[PDB]
C-alpha cells in the first residue's frame, strides 16, 4: 500500500520543551502544505518551544486551528499550520465522509516519536462514540474506538482502516482499547483553501 507509505512519511515526532528539558512527547501527522494534525490536549501543557521533526519553534511560528464538531464541542484533533516549512504529501483525499467503518474491520495506527521511534500497531474497530470521558474527568467528542495495544506518546498518530482510508489521529486509550479523533475530508478541504 502506497498509502501506508505516504502516511508513514508524513508522520513526524513532536516534543515540548520547558527550561531546556523535554517535558512531553507525541506525534504529528502532516496532511498538506505545512499543516499537521496534533492532539489538542498537547497545548494544555506549559512549554517554551515545540520541536517538530527536530525543528524548534515558538508560538510566533505557527497557527493552531480547532475543530467544531457537532454533537447532540471541540475535538481533540487540532490542526497546526507552520508559517513556513517543507511541504508534506497532500493526503486529504484519503480521509472520508463517503463511507464509514464497521465493527471488526482491521485498524492500523502509525507512530513516529522519540520514545519508541517508528512503529505500527494493529487492532480491530468497534464503534463511533459521540463523547468519551477520560480518567482525569475530561471529555472528547467524535471518537472512533478500537481494540488495540497503545501507550502514552501515540497521540497524534494516524489511524487507518477493501479500499483503505484515514479515520483520524490517535487521542487516548487504555486497557486494550484505543480511541482516535475522527476527521472529515471536507473539513480538511475547507481548511486547505482557508490556509491556501
Amino acid at each position: 500500500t502506497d498509502l501506508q507509505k505516504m502516511v508513514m512519511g508524513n508522520t513526524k515526532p513532536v516534543e515540548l520543551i520547558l527550561d531546556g528539558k523535554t517535558v512531553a512527547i507525541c506525534c504529528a501527522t502532516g496532511v498538506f502544505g505545512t499543516a499537521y494534525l496534533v492532539p489538542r490536549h498537547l497545548f494544555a501543557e506549559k512549554y517554551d518551544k515545540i520541536m517538530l521533526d527536530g525543528r524548534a519553534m515558538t508560538d510566533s511560528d505557527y497557527r493552531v486551528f480547532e475543530f467544531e464538531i457537532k454533537v447532540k464541542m471541540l475535538s481533540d484533533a487540532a490542526l497546526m499550520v507552520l508559517h513556513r516549512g517543507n511541504k508534506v504529501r497532500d493526503i486529504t483525499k484519503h480521509f472520508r465522509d463517503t463511507a464509514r467503518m464497521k465493527k471488526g474491520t482491521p485498524v492500523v495506527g502509525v507512530v513516529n516519536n522519540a520514545d519508541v521511534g517508528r512503529l505500527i500497531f494493529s487492532g480491530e474497530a468497534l464503534t463511533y462514540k459521540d463523547i468519551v470521558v477520560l480518567m482525569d474527568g475530561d471529555t472528547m467528542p467524535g471518537l472512533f474506538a478500537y481494540k488495540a495495544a497503545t501507550r502514552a506518546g501515540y497521540a497524534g498518530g494516524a489511524v487507518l482502516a477493501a479500499d483503505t482510508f484515514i479515520v483520524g489521529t490517535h487521542s487516548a486509550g487504555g486497557n486494550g482499547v484505543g480511541y482516535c479523533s475522527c476527521v472529515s475530508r471536507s473539513m480538511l478541504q475547507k481548511m486547505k483553501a482557508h490556509v491556501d
Binding site: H41, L134, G153, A172, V177
Partner: peptide
C-alpha cells in the same frame, strides 16, 4: 476510563 495519550514528564 481511557487516558489522554500524550507522553507527559
Amino acid at each position: 476510563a481511557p487516558a489522554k495519550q500524550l507522553l507527559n514528564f
